């Protein structure tokens, strides 16, 4: 997905702030559309797993 969409998903999430910042450092190191898409795919899985507690 786009960097802006991924950023918003992390920022709006209920993850611990330091864990949000961790994910942003990873995102900053990601390069390319394919890799951004894979990151977003991982991210959604993480968020939904965390939410489902």
UniProtKB/Swiss-Prot annotation:
Post-translational modification: Phosphorylation on serines by host CK2 is necessary for the formation of viral factories.
Organism: Measles virus (strain Edmonston) (MeV)
Record field: transmembrane: none
Recorded domain comment: The N-terminus consists of a long intrinsically disordered tail. The central part contains the coiled-coil multimerization domain (MD). Forms a four-stranded coiled coil structure. The C-terminus constitutes the alpha-helical domain (XD) that binds to the nucleocapsid (N-RNA complex).
Residue numbers spanned by region X domain (XD): 1-49
Similarity remark: Belongs to the morbillivirus P protein family.
Domain of life of the organism encoding this protein: Viruses
Function, in words: Essential cofactor of the RNA polymerase L that plays a central role in the transcription and replication by forming the polymerase complex with RNA polymerase L and recruiting L to the genomic N-RNA template for RNA synthesis. Also plays a central role in the encapsidation of nascent RNA chains by forming the encapsidation complex with the nucleocapsid protein N (N-P complex). Acts as a chaperone for newly synthesized free N protein, so-called N0, allowing encapsidation of nascent RNA chains during replication.
Quaternary structure, from the entry: Homotetramer. Interacts (via multimerization domain and XD domain) with polymerase L; this interaction forms the polymerase L-P complex. Interacts (via N-terminus) with N0 (via Ncore); this interaction allows P to chaperon N0 to avoid N polymerization and non-specific RNA binding before encapsidation. Interacts (via C-terminus) with N-RNA template (via Ntail); this interaction maintains the P/L complex anchored to the nucleocapsid template during the sequential transcription. Interacts (via C-terminus) with protein C this interaction allows C to associate with the ribonucleocapsid.
Shown stretch of the complete protein: 459 to 507 of 507
Interaction with the nucleocapsid (N-RNA): region residues: 1-49
Name this protein carries in UniProt: Phosphoprotein
């Amino acid at each position: 997905a786009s960097r802006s969409v991924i950023r918003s998903i992390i920022k709006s999430s209920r993850l611990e702030e330091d864990r949000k910042r961790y994910l942003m450092t990873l995102l900053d190191d990601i390069k390319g559309a394919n890799d951004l898409a894979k990151f977003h795919q991982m991210l959604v899985k993480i968020i939904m797993k965390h939410h489902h507690h």
